[PDB]
Amino acid sequence: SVHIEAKQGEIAESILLPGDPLRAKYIAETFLEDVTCYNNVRGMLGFTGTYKGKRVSVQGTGMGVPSISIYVNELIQSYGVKNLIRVGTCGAIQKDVKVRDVIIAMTACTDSNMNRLTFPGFDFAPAANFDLLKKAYDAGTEKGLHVRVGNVLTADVFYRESMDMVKKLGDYGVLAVEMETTALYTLAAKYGVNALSVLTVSNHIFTGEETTSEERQTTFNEMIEIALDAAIQ
Amino acid sequence: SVHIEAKQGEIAESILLPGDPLRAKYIAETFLEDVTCYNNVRGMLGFTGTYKGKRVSVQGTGMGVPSISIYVNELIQSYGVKNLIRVGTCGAIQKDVKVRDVIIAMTACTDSNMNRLTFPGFDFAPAANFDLLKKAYDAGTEKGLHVRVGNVLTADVFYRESMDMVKKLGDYGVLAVEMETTALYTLAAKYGVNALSVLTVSNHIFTGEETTSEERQTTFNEMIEIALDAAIQ
Amino acid sequence: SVHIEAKQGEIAESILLPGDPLRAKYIAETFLEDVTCYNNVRGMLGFTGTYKGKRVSVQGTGMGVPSISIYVNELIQSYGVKNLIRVGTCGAIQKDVKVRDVIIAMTACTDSNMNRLTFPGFDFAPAANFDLLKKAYDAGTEKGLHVRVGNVLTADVFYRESMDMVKKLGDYGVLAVEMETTALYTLAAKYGVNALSVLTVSNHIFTGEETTSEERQTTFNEMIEIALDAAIQ
Amino acid sequence: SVHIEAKQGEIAESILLPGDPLRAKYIAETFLEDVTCYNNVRGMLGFTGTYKGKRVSVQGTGMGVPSISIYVNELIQSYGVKNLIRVGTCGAIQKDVKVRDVIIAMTACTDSNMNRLTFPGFDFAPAANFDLLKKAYDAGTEKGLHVRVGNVLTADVFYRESMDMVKKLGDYGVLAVEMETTALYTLAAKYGVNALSVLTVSNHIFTGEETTSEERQTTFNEMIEIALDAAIQ
Amino acid sequence: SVHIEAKQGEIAESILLPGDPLRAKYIAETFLEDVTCYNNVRGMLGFTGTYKGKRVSVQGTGMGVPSISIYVNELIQSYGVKNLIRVGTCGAIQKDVKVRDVIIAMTACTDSNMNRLTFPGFDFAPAANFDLLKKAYDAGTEKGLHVRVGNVLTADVFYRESMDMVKKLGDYGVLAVEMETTALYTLAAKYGVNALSVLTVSNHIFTGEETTSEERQTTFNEMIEIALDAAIQ
Amino acid sequence: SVHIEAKQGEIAESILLPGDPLRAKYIAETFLEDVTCYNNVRGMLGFTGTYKGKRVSVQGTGMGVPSISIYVNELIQSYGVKNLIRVGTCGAIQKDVKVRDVIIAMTACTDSNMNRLTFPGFDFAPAANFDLLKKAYDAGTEKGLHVRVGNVLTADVFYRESMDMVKKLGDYGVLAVEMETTALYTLAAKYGVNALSVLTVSNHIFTGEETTSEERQTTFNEMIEIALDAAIQ
Ligand SMILES: Nc1ncnc2c1ncn2[C@@H]1O[C@H](CO)[C@@H](O)[C@H]1O
Ligand SMILES: Nc1ncnc2c1ncn2[C@@H]1O[C@H](CO)[C@@H](O)[C@H]1O
Ligand SMILES: Nc1ncnc2c1ncn2[C@@H]1O[C@H](CO)[C@@H](O)[C@H]1O
Ligand SMILES: Nc1ncnc2c1ncn2[C@@H]1O[C@H](CO)[C@@H](O)[C@H]1O
Ligand SMILES: Nc1ncnc2c1ncn2[C@@H]1O[C@H](CO)[C@@H](O)[C@H]1O
Ligand SMILES: Nc1ncnc2c1ncn2[C@@H]1O[C@H](CO)[C@@H](O)[C@H]1O
């Protein structure tokens, strides 16, 4: 496809979608066997391998609705991908959401215009695939993680001049901010395929708490395991 | 409160919210014991009784976002209600959704302006309480119903001049149309309480299939049972 | 029709539209002769009788744009209704508007999205039928009421978190808040029929003054008389 | 003021507002006595004189919401004007509205953003002063004119690429198109003063019928007479 | 055309567009030879003459997007005009922009709805013709003027209740406020012809500095010279 | 900063901003001397070196408004960058724009919501720094390139379901589509620094013409040279 140099058949039907291509590399090297790298266009690494005997892929998406939309469109339309699980990070809005919690997004709010252009006059609420959601929830519960299922904000702007509206969204139960889920869920629904976002809380937006990858590595690894485990079902 | 004549303490902390006040009466008479009627203002019947030994209420909401918003605000703010389950009907958009299916709304799309006014420039995605959702899903699965968990449209207009956008929403996975869920979910989130909508598909919007209450009574009764059963947990 | 169980011909061509179905009952019992009740679906009472020898009906609408839109569509399209007069209550915004004043709405502002969806990019100003307006104005003037003709707000939200915008509308001459007129006027114009809203001020939104039905009964009765009197012309 | 060179007191409290400054000149020369010209800034002629013994003024506004807004703000805020009657032309949308009809605008629709900026999320419906409206209606009825009271469109664009939305507005009862009324009515309401628009239909937008000033001069003169006659009351 | 009484061929292919028709007269009398006046409809003076031997015209536009849009549509579509240079005034927002500076607008921001109606969901950025822009810039630089090339605001409202957003636009580099450029640039682009706006700063919006025409006459004359000089190339 | 691991002082005040980090590497290796790599976070390569003796940097941005906004905010606010030139590719809309043309964006249209959120009710037109624009234009003209200066579309969606609006923008003179310029120009203006986008046309959106990097390498190299050459001035 335009942004992926893989041949037909090189990408598995189940795929994990980290934002960071170097996390795709980490995931492939850490969890998968019989790995190949099928893409390096724009440095946006993608790999296919095997996990507990089942083929699965992992593809960086970049940051933001427009970037992930490019990759998700191509994966679905050109490579026949059927199950897409974003595995990423997010920033907690609410005090009761803690760093290292795992959030499974039921739906996402957004300040993107992408859906207003498609459905003029409507608020489109992008929805996770429930069967994937339940599988991931059950796996995370069994794994011993703190798992929160709820609403997130998909933001276009990481650096917002005022966080007043983000605070207000927190007062309406929104758990955390990230930059991709609306697009993944909307496009998966458009094409009749299955999507989910499983997120590690890496920072808290108002307290200023932050982590390095190493400082959340054990939680992150466990989260990747549940995302894979849902995928292989 | 302005629209409910009940005394403090007369309304239980768990409440079912049919749109039709005569369905509130049917639910109270059919399922509850030790019933009183606490409201007849505007004919919008409300009752409190006991189900399997646990106090529970049932309150008509009327049709549309503005009507249900009035009742939900008053129930939460004046009567201390904590768990609110809308029990209603909806019209299927998709061919694969069948009359007599039970839909549990994860989230809702809308053509209402209510949330655009609150969050200018954002799409707010109203979310069910996951713990109530899971309880209802598990109960419905055990009860032997066809249960679908997904997205609905909360419409302001029942009689729409063109159904083009409703069809398009169906192509993006939206299951059915109804007229209340966005408001219930948004206000419950605002006030930190728990909400869910459990819906019976009573009509199919493009095929023209329709039912009378009697023609869906067994399914409807089973749906009320799961809504109660979730409530009493 | 879907929400009205009347046979063809049972509803008169002129109809009064209170929001409260119990007010429809009061109006029929108090003013009309040879009364029948043609609807009890959803408790939304409707009656037909005679006033000064002329057939006229009265139909509850419920609260909010979506509810009244359902009933008005059905009355016009399925029952051939030609003259529709909402008779309701409203909350004064301005200090110079007093409780027990009668407001005849020339037009209505709104926070509903209903007309933005129909006329994207435009502000649609819904207009009363002038000939009905003049008849009601002349009748109210003769009856000795305080009658104000002007602008109202049709609100989707009764419980608004901030009343700043309602205050601002008052500073631009808007007289009072209610929850139905935009829909009635827009749909009547769509179908080429005649509509008017005649409202009793029952509360003042910033002073906190409020009334019971009994406390405004004489004014309300006189208002119903002028609404009927316009109708029978 | 910035756009009017008159001294304080030179402009009367009642004023007619044609769009064309040369029509202001025609009105002053044809109907008024003891006339002075108080403004020629930008060629936007303004005059004060006497009609049936009462002082009255006439001020060109130019075309469009932004132009009339400048003049109306200055007249109200700097010159203390209290009664403002636009006297202009319009293009009929509906077949049943005829060239040479006089339309008295109750309210106006618009494609301008002026009120959306002031009342974000709301449709503001600008309203005529009813007492001026009634006076003009009664005077026009007595004068023997065809007078229509209703809704108009205040357009920003005279040359619209598609007239689809204008046709649709006609199907919702909107009588004619012009380019000033929303602004006049909104600003008069803002400042607590009295406004009305009295319009001659000079063209029909879909049939292509058009007139010269001479071809509508008798109707136009009679319309000016009723506008003055209302003003002097 | 509807608003211009000129015969075909009486208007030159290059035209200057002051907002004030009396400035059109001043420009024609001061700079042009062999002058005729081709329009006095609505007092909106237009002239054709010769400058350094080349035919050129000058046409008042009035104030605001809707007024200039009328004239620009007619000039382009009915009179075959190819090069259109607005020559006007503006109000500085930024402290670093000085009265008597000449601003050449690269593009324009707006609070008009004109382009949102044409391109729903998009921000359209109207662009100057670069070749005209460069010619005017080079001529102004040679003439010894202070020339600033940048962004302006095309406002619908001269009298804005709050200038907060205008200040904010200044903080994002917007140089000055005026009331026509968006329309000129958008329509010229639509029809494939060449437009530019060359503006004299006549007032500073926050400091209150203001000028009479006489107080900026030398700068204004030099600006007209560069606008002509670009035109005749 | 959060997404760049460079120490203070490691990034030069002038920077080129390709979307593709592998193009940043190509630019550094091909044109610069004394090169270091200061960032590999998320694979988003950044380098500093010397060109004709002057320090300059090159930093990948990723694709889309949200991605470039992250990097531009950090470069300006944390690293003190003053001159930012995006060097990228774009897709021609118009037939008269050819593959291998170089487009210098004066301004950009967008379907992003980023500026509507910042300036509610306004269309913000993001503007290039004119002095950088002129330098690049003069350098490209001297270099013998086909250089077009004009308007572009900054799109959020690469894969748009209908290209109707993109075609319409082409009919209003918009030259090409890309995915970053609105953000770069808006943020540079916000912070008072200098930005420009210099683009190679790599594909034609309606004809289907496309190129590989090798197939446009000579043009691309010349474009990089002019971007550098402007930068070092
Ligand atoms: N506080 C935050 N705000 C926005 N995005 C965040 C935040 N924390 C983590 N992310 C995620 O990391 C990237 C931005 O650093 C995005 O891909 C986004 O999903
Ligand atoms: N097809 C439908 N469209 C809209 N609302 C529906 C439909 N079917 C059932 N409903 C529900 O029933 C009422 C409208 O008849 C509303 O309360 C709504 O939730
Ligand atoms: N203050 C108020 N705000 C909104 N609606 C009101 C108010 N007072 C009376 N109403 C009317 O009564 C109902 C809400 O109580 C609605 O039908 C509405 O028209
Ligand atoms: N068909 C029309 N469309 C828009 N404005 C019109 C029309 N006919 C008359 N007008 C009026 O005349 C001017 C435009 O020619 C405006 O001031 C406007 O109010
Ligand atoms: N401060 C200002 N605000 C708006 N328009 C201005 C200003 N100064 C000059 N103008 C120009 O002059 C007219 C308004 O006085 C308009 O045509 C406009 O372009
Ligand atoms: N046809 C196109 N549509 C959108 N972006 C494009 C196109 N061609 C090149 N681009 C650029 O390349 C990337 C998308 O492939 C974006 O960074 C964008 O700026």
Give strand pairing partners of C172: none
What span, in angstroms and rounded, lies between the C-alpha atoms of F21 and F222? 19
| Residue labelled with tokens 């005829």 | D98
DSSP string, chain C: --S--PPTTSS-SEEEE-SSHHHHHHHHHHH-EEEEEEE-GGG--EEEEEETTEEEEEE---SSHHHHHHHHHHHHHHH---EEEEEEEEEE-STTS-TT-EEEEEEEEES-SHHHHHSTT-B---B--HHHHHHHHHHHHHHT--EEEEEEEE-S-SS-S--HHHHHHHHTT--EEESSHHHHHHHHHHHT-EEEEEEEEEEETTT--B--TGGGHHHHHHHHHHHHHHHT-
Alpha-carbon torsion (E170, E173, E175, E176), positive or negative: negative
What span, in angstroms and rounded, lies between the C-alpha atoms of D133 and D104? 7
Go through B140-168 and write b for each residue having 16 or more CB atoms within 10 A of its CB, e for each that does not: beeeebebbbbbbbbbbbbebeeeebbeb
Burial class (CB in 10 A: 0-12, 13-18, 19+), E218: exposed
Give strand pairing partners of C50: C33, C55
Best of B109, B172, B174 to substitute, by most chain A Cβ atoms within 10 angstroms, is B172
Report the length, in residues, of chain E.
Answer: 233
What span, in angstroms and rounded, lies between the C-alpha atoms of A114 and A156? 10
At F78, list the tokens: 């944390």
- Asked whether C140 and C119 are in contact (CB, 8 A), the reply is no
CATH numbers and ranges of domains, chain C: 1-233 (3.40.50.1580)
| Residue labelled with tokens 């926070």 | C111
What span, in angstroms and rounded, lies between the C-alpha atoms of E188 and E129? 9
At A127, list the tokens: 């929805």
CA of E99 to the centre of ligand 1 (A): 45
**Declared resolution, Å:** 1.4
CA distances from B95 to B98, D38, E26, F65 (A): 7, 72, 71, 38
Q: Name the region of D221 (left: φ>0; alpha: ψ -120 to 50; beta: rest).
A: alpha
- Asked whether C65 and B66 are in contact (CB, 8 A), the reply is yes
Q: Name the region of E34 (left: φ>0; alpha: ψ -120 to 50; beta: rest).
A: left
Chain D residue numbers touching C107 (CB-CB < 8 A):
106-107, 125-127
Q: Which helix (H) or strand (E) holds E46?
A: strand E46-51
At F96, list the tokens: 């008269």
Name the nearest CA neighbour of E17 among E180, E158, E128, E176: E180
What span, in angstroms and rounded, lies between the C-alpha atoms of D188 and D186? 6
Phi, psi of C59 (to 5 degrees): -140, 120
First to last CA, chain E: 28
CA of C154 to the centre of ligand 3 (A): 9
Which amino acid is residue A37, in one-letter code?
A: C
Q: CA B216: distance to chain centroid?
A: 17
Torsion angle in degrees (nearest 10) through CA of B170, B174, B175, B178: -100
Q: Which helix (H) or strand (E) holds D141?
A: helix D130-143
DSSP string, E174-228: --EEESSHHHHHHHHHHHT-EEEEEEEEEEETTT--B--TGGGHHHHHHHHHHHH
| Secondary structure (H, E, C), F132-158 | HHHHHHHHHHHHCCCEEEEEEEECCCC
- Asked whether D200 and D100 are in contact (CB, 8 A), the reply is yes
At E88, list the tokens: 């006007």
Pick the ligand that lies closest to the CA of residue C157. 3
Pairing of strands A14-17, A54-59: parallel
Give strand pairing partners of A89: A200
- Asked whether B59 and B39 are in contact (CB, 8 A), the reply is yes
Residue of B nearest to A193 (CA): B173
* Three-state DSSP state, B85: strand
Find the DSSP H helices in A65-180.
65-79, 114-118, 130-143, 164-171
Burial class (CB in 10 A: 0-12, 13-18, 19+), E114: buried
- Asked whether C117 and B161 are in contact (CB, 8 A), the reply is no
First to last CA, chain F: 28
- All chains having 3 or more CB pairs closer than 8 angstroms to chain B: A, C, D, F
Name the nearest CA neighbour of A90 among A185, A165, A202, A167: A202
> How many C/D residue pairs have CB atoms within 8 Å?
102
Q: Name the region of F53 (left: φ>0; alpha: ψ -120 to 50; beta: rest).
A: left
Which residues are CB-neighbours of A62 under 8 A, at least 6 positions away? A19, A21, A44, A68, A71, F62, F63, F64, F67
Inter-chain CB proximity C65 and B66 less than 8 Å: yes
At C71, list the tokens: 């009933």
Inter-chain CB proximity C113 and B111 less than 8 Å: yes
Name the nearest CA neighbour of C15 among C80, C64, C92: C80
Name the nearest CA neighbour of B73 among B101, B37, B114: B114
**Residues C97-100: contacts with CB within 8 Å, 24+ apart?**
C97/C148, C97/C175, C97/C176, C97/C201, C97/C204, C98/C146, C98/C201, C98/C204, C99/C201, C99/C202, C99/C203, C99/C204, C99/C209, C99/C211, C99/C216, C100/C146, C100/C200, C100/C201, C100/C211, C100/C216, C100/C219
Pairing of strands F83-92, F194-204: parallel
**Residue A92 neighbours by CB distance under 10 Å:** 24
- Asked whether E58 and E27 are in contact (CB, 8 A), the reply is yes
What span, in angstroms and rounded, lies between the C-alpha atoms of A89 and B209? 45
At F93, list the tokens: 């809309």
Helix axes B130-143, B217-231, angle to 10 degrees: 140
At D146, list the tokens: 């065809």
Pairing of strands B147-154, A54-59: unpaired
CA of D165 to the centre of ligand 4 (A): 17
DSSP annotation of A7: P
Q: Provide the shortest C-alpha distance from residue D166 to chain B (in Å).
A: 17
Which amino acid is residue B58, in one-letter code?
A: V
Name the nearest CA neighbour of E156 among E121, E199, E108: E108
Burial class (CB in 10 A: 0-12, 13-18, 19+), D39: buried
What span, in angstroms and rounded, lies between the C-alpha atoms of A221 and A200? 10
* Three-state DSSP state, D181: helix
Q: Which residues of F touch B (CB under 8 A)?
A: 113, 116-117, 120
Find the DSSP H helices in A32-100.
65-79
Q: Cα–Cα–Cα angle for F66, F68, F74, nearest 5°?
A: 105
Chain D residue numbers touching E70 (CB-CB < 8 A):
63, 158-159
- Asked whether E166 and D74 are in contact (CB, 8 A), the reply is no
CA distances from B15 to B57, B110, B182, E100 (A): 5, 24, 17, 70
Count of alpha carbons within 13 angstroms of residue A118, beta-carbon side: 24
| Residue labelled with tokens 């940051």 | A63
The pick from C61, C63, C69, C213 for probing ligand 3's pocket by mutation, whose C-beta has the most ligand atoms within 8 angstroms, reads C63
- Asked whether A152 and A182 are in contact (CB, 8 A), the reply is no
| Residue labelled with tokens 């923008």 | F169
What span, in angstroms and rounded, lies between the C-alpha atoms of E75 and E24? 15
CA distances from A186 to A91, F33, F172 (A): 22, 46, 31
What span, in angstroms and rounded, lies between the C-alpha atoms of E150 and E198? 11
Give strand pairing partners of D92: D176, D204
What span, in angstroms and rounded, lies between the C-alpha atoms of F3 and F72? 11
What span, in angstroms and rounded, lies between the C-alpha atoms of A159 and F2? 11
Name the nearest CA neighbour of F1 among F63, F71, F69: F71
- Asked whether D227 and D106 are in contact (CB, 8 A), the reply is no
What span, in angstroms and rounded, lies between the C-alpha atoms of A149 and A94? 14
What span, in angstroms and rounded, lies between the C-alpha atoms of D200 and D176? 10
Which amino acid is residue E102, in one-letter code?
A: V
Name the nearest CA neighbour of E194 among F128, F171, F173, F104: F173
- Asked whether D194 and D129 are in contact (CB, 8 A), the reply is yes
- Asked whether F51 and F228 are in contact (CB, 8 A), the reply is yes
**Residue A138 neighbours by CB distance under 10 Å:** 15
- Asked whether D200 and C182 are in contact (CB, 8 A), the reply is no
Report the length, in residues, of chain D.
Answer: 233
* Three-state DSSP state, E36: strand
Helix axes C130-143, C217-231, angle to 10 degrees: 140
At A155, list the tokens: 């933001």
What span, in angstroms and rounded, lies between the C-alpha atoms of B140 and B199? 12
The pick from D89, D97, D213 for probing ligand 4's pocket by mutation, whose C-beta has the most ligand atoms within 8 angstroms, reads D89
What span, in angstroms and rounded, lies between the C-alpha atoms of E173 and F107? 13
At F215, list the tokens: 């197939």
At D218, list the tokens: 């008798």
- Asked whether C169 and C93 are in contact (CB, 8 A), the reply is yes
Report the length, in residues, of chain C.
Answer: 233
At D82, list the tokens: 């209290």
Longest dimension (CA), chain C: 49
Name the nearest CA neighbour of A183 among A3, A4, A17: A17
CA of C22 to the centre of ligand 5 (A): 58
Q: Cα–Cα–Cα angle for C61, C62, C63, nearest 5°?
A: 120
What span, in angstroms and rounded, lies between the C-alpha atoms of A92 and A103? 10
What span, in angstroms and rounded, lies between the C-alpha atoms of F50 and C56? 89
Alpha-carbon torsion (A160, A163, A164, A169), positive or negative: positive
What span, in angstroms and rounded, lies between the C-alpha atoms of A76 and A56? 15
Name the nearest CA neighbour of D20 among D54, D53, D67, D66: D67
Helix axes F21-31, F217-231, angle to 10 degrees: 80
What span, in angstroms and rounded, lies between the C-alpha atoms of E38 and E48? 7
- Asked whether C156 and C179 are in contact (CB, 8 A), the reply is yes
At F116, list the tokens: 């509507």
| Residue labelled with tokens 């939460």 | B76
* Three-state DSSP state, A112: coil
